[PDB]
């Protein structure tokens, strides 16, 4: 194990262990192991001590980054606590660190969370990624925290190649004339410290003077998914390929339907009037033209409201050029609208819902005159094909070369997602209640004061 309270240098702790064992040391730097440590337990045993969120999460961030900052090359987080939060003193004990963190304002917490985001922008390549995400309801767990709450996931512990291709498509083909961000770290909520997200891609988002992210009030945020069930090869007997050929030569909604229904578990579901969508995939059609063959009750009022707000703006479909024709270049061949909409019951709806809440929280804390407009949210779905013997070695999107070991993108669908306010408020409240119950049962020796948390 590693000691967040030890004064030993992490580089020395890790020196002389296998990479396997180093991974274990780093996993031990989690919020859960922090709260389980003898020194937190001892502090928490006192009658006067009733720890609050987000203050205890801020305290953890300090100890975490004091331990790991040098190893991951970002001493900015620790410097800020010491200089701006601790009055210039290098605090080492949990009682003092906690007290000073308890005295932070929302702009200081915002600043810390922004520095942490910047320190973690390489996401799962960063050795502290897994440890930092512990104890937090992240956007990939948000549906589970609201609707499931079972042992399929945990709050506390006490593929990527194709996603990168889709980012390149968004950046190069959809937003060539704009400032975009391709690499986002982990953004904790500065107001509660129980929620957090990382984003896949955003357009109209920049680094500011020193040296954090700036979301424009009108930025465009995209969650990227890849549909591996639809990966085909240009072979004689391949039924997906058959449907793809038709779509490529004649881009439109009918060719698209045949493509969707060329597999046994289709990504699109027809949902009739007053009927409850299943959770099976994340696109739904409300028009009978997509049919190729449970009612909403009065208690599904939140679902009804979400459908109401997600049944107007259509998806954009981008058919890409085939690099077997162009010997390399992949650009937009054709573009068309499809009456396909987000499934408001699907876990991806809940994922973007939480990313919207965190993005809007950070925009709210940003200094400056508030401007007219709110950000827009999308799911960007990529579809792919195997490389064949006659495909070029070197494919490109704009300047960017594709790794020769990644599949070729064929199709991009961009689907808008809208979030009614009352609906977001209810779901975040249920998830926060589940966080609080789970914190009390997991760390029952902590006299949690959730007064501040329920204010948020």
The answer to whether 200 is a known ligand-binding residue is yes
Q: How many CB atoms lie within 10 A of CB 215?
A: 19
Q: Residue 70 or 163: which CB sits closer to Mg ion?
A: 163
Q: Residue 24 or 160: which CB sits closer to Mg ion?
A: 160
Rule CB under 5 A: which of 322-341 touch Mg ion? none
* Residue span 46-85 as binding mask against Mg ion, x where in contact by CB under 5 A, dash where not: ----------------------------------------
The answer to whether 155 is a known ligand-binding residue is no
Helices (H) and strands (E) in the chain, counts: 18, 15
Residue 444 Cβ vs Mg ion, minimum distance, rounded to whole Å: 35
CA distances from 263 to 154, 241, 243, 427 (A): 33, 11, 10, 34
**What are the E-state strand segments in 130-270?**
137-138, 180-181, 187-188, 195-197, 201-207, 213-226, 268-270
Report whether 273 contacts 387 (CB < 8 A).
no
Q: Residue 184 or 443: which CB sits closer to Mg ion?
A: 184
Closest CA to 55 of 14, 23, 97: 97
Q: Residue 221 or 224: which CB sits closer to Mg ion?
A: 224
Q: Residue 224 or 431: which CB sits closer to Mg ion?
A: 224
106-119 helix and 347-365 helix, angle to the nearest 10 degrees? 120
Residue 197 Cβ vs Mg ion, minimum distance, rounded to whole Å: 11
Residue 117 Cβ vs Mg ion, minimum distance, rounded to whole Å: 17
Q: Residue 162 or 363: which CB sits closer to Mg ion?
A: 162
Residue whose token pair is 């070729």: 408
* Residue span 154-193 as binding mask against Mg ion, x where in contact by CB under 5 A, dash where not: ----------------------------------------
Residue 202 Cβ vs Mg ion, minimum distance, rounded to whole Å: 13
Closest CA to 145 of 452, 357, 446: 357
Q: Residues near 275 by Cβ (< 8 Å), separated by ≥ 6?
A: 294, 295, 296
Report whether 199 contacts 221 (CB < 8 A).
yes
The answer to whether 369 is a known ligand-binding residue is no
Q: What is the bridge-based pairing of β-strands 201-207 and 195-197?
A: unpaired
Rule CB under 5 A: which of 188-247 touch Mg ion? 200, 224
* Residue span 348-387 as binding mask against Mg ion, x where in contact by CB under 5 A, dash where not: ----------------------------------------
The answer to whether 223 is a known ligand-binding residue is yes
Give the integer Cα–Cα distance in Å for 199 and 272: 33
Residue 408 Cβ vs Mg ion, minimum distance, rounded to whole Å: 19
Token reading at 305: 């409201």
Residue 225 Cβ vs Mg ion, minimum distance, rounded to whole Å: 6
Binding region: 163, 200, 223-224
Footprint on this chain of Mg ion (rule: CB under 5 A): 200, 224
């Amino acid at each position: 194990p590693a000691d967040l309270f030890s004064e030993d240098y992490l580089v020395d702790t890790l020196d002389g262990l296998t990479v396997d064992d180093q991974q274990a040391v780093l996993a031990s730097l989690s919020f859960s192991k922090f709260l389980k440590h003898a020194k937190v337990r001892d502090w928490c045993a006192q009658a006067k001590i009733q720890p609050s969120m987000p203050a205890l999460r801020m305290a953890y961030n300090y100890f975490l980054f004091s331990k790991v900052g040098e190893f991951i090359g970002s001493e900015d987080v620790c410097n800020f606590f010491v200089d701006r939060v601790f009055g210039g003193v290098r605090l080492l004990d949990v009682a003092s660190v906690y007290a000073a963190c308890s005295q932070m304002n929302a702009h200081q917490r915002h600043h810390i969370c922004c520095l942490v985001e910047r320190a973690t922008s390489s996401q799962s390549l960063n050795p502290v990624w897994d440890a930092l995400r512990d104890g937090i309801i992240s956007s990939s767990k948000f549906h589970w925290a609201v609707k499931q709450q079972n042992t399929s996931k945990k709050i506390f512990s006490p593929g990527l190649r194709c996603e990168e291709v889709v980012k390149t498509l968004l950046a190069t083909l959809l937003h060539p004339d704009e400032t975009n961000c391709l690499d986002y770290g982990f953004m904790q909520s500065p107001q509660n410290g129980i929620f957090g997200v990382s984003l896949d891609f955003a357009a109209n988002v920049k680094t500011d003077t020193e040296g954090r992210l700036q979301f424009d009030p009108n930025c465009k945020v995209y969650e990227i998914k890849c549909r591996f069930k639809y990966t085909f090869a240009k072979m004689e007997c391949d039924p997906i390929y058959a449907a793809y050929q038709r779509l490529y030569e004649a881009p439109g909604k009918l060719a698209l339907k045949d493509f969707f229904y060329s597999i046994s578990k289709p990504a699109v579901e027809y949902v009739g009037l007053g009927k409850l969508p299943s959770e099976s995939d994340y696109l739904v059609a409300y028009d009978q033209e997509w049919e190729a063959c449970r009612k909403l009750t009065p208690l599904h009022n939140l679902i009804r409201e979400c459908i109401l707000h997600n049944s107007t703006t259509e998806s954009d479909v981008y058919v890409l050029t085939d690099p077997q024709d162009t010997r390399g270049q992949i650009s937009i061949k054709a573009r068309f609208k499809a009456n396909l909409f987000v499934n408001v019951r699907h876990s991806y709806f809940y994922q973007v819902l939480l990313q919207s809440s965190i993005v809007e929280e950070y925009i709210g804390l940003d200094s400056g005159i508030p401007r007219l407009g709110s950000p827009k949210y999308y799911i960007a779905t990529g579809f792919f094909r195997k490389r064949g013997y006659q495909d070029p070695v070197n494919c490109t999107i704009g300047g960017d070369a594709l790794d020769p070991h990644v599949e070729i993108p064929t199709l991009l669908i961009v689907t808008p997602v809208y979030f009614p306010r009352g609906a977001k408020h209810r779901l975040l409240h249920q998830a926060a209640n589940f966080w609080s119950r789970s914190a009390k049962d997991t760390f029952p020796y902590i006299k949690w004061d959730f007064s501040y948390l329920s204010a948020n």
